[model samples]
Target: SMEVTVPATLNVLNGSDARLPCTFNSCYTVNHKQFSLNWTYQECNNCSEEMFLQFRMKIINLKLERFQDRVEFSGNPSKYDVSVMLRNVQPEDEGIYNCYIMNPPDRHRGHGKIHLQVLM
Candidate 1:
């Protein structure tokens, strides 16, 4: 599985962009041919939701109607690391994000956690 962690706080300015990097580590040998990385963020301001595994290009099961315009993904399976860039951040764009990778047919899966804080 992949393990990811973010700093306790992320200080960023307004009207700018910030890239949140998620680092993951594999514990057991996984089938690269069948495994895949899925990035998801917790909604409801509590991160008590589940990660979406189908949508790789956009955020699913969430109110992405507004934030969809600012979310960008720079993911590469070969690197084993992924990043999500948020453009034109605002004051309300602050919370704890979780990066979960589902490697099916394997003994274990990949998961990571991160917290984002916007400093105005």
Candidate 2:
């Protein structure tokens, strides 16, 4: 099974930039056409997440209104990093950022979580 690793918690100053890093580990990789990742946002553990960013370490799309135009893909899946960047960090935007790694090579799923706290 592949494991998605990332910082458990992050603190960023208000109006500053914050980088959410996500790296995955696989025992063995097929590497033939199934490497992609996306990120979602959730205010609480029980809250339904929204797709703020979606890509395949390739096409970057920020379609979510709350975080649109401020989210950017900032990692190389080839190098195992599926990270992303957030600009002008806001208080309301501080919450759980879920990193979902879509890997079928390992025949499993990789899920990583990041709790963001913004400082005023």
Candidate 3:
């Protein structure tokens, strides 16, 4: 089993940086061969989700072109943290962000939502 922890909400000023905190604890060892972390974004409460980034071993991929230059990995997996930072918050950037923990041999834990509220 895996447990993911994320803030209920994150408030940020427009054009500022925002950190979406996500940490997890799992019953399996994390490694390149069998573990990965993924981050996705949803426009609203029930909108379709889009992939933002993914991490495997030391390889991190910012999968979305929209966030190509605006997202960065800010967590250390050795510590079970898979947080990410979003730079230059914009109005359209406000949404529900999710963190997915995948450690094979165990069921994945997902949808650790962090509601991002961007203020002008």
Show model 3 residue runs off by greater than 4 Å.
none
Question: What digit string (tens of lDDT, one per residue) describes model 2 on residues 25-105?
Answer: 775663536766668898888898788776653566867788857788887766777788898888878889988777765
- Root-mean-square deviation of Cα positions for candidate 3 versus the true structure, in angstroms: 1.8
lDDT of 1: 0.60
Question: Best candidate, lDDT-wise?
Answer: 3
Model 2's TM-score against the true structure = 0.87
Model 2 / residue 36 / CA error / Å? 2.7
Candidate 2 — what's its lDDT? Answer: 0.79
For model 2, state the Cα shift of residue 44 in Å: 2.1
lDDT of 3 by residue, 22-111 (tens): 998876777767777788898889888788787766656756776767888888886888888898888788888998888777775555
Q: Could you tell me every candidate's TM-score relative to the true structure?
A: 0.69, 0.87, 0.87
- Error (Å) of candidate 3 at residue 53 is 0.3
| Candidate 3 local Cα displacement, residue 63, angstroms | 4.8
Candidate 3 at 94: error in angstroms? Answer: 0.2
Q: Put down candidate 1 lDDT per residue, 1-120, tens digits, no spaces.
A: 345555545677777787877755655444566655665655446546444333343334343654657777655544655667777877676666666665555546656666666677
State residue 71's C-alpha deviation in candidate 3, in Å.
Answer: 0.7
Which scores better on lDDT, 1 or 3?
3
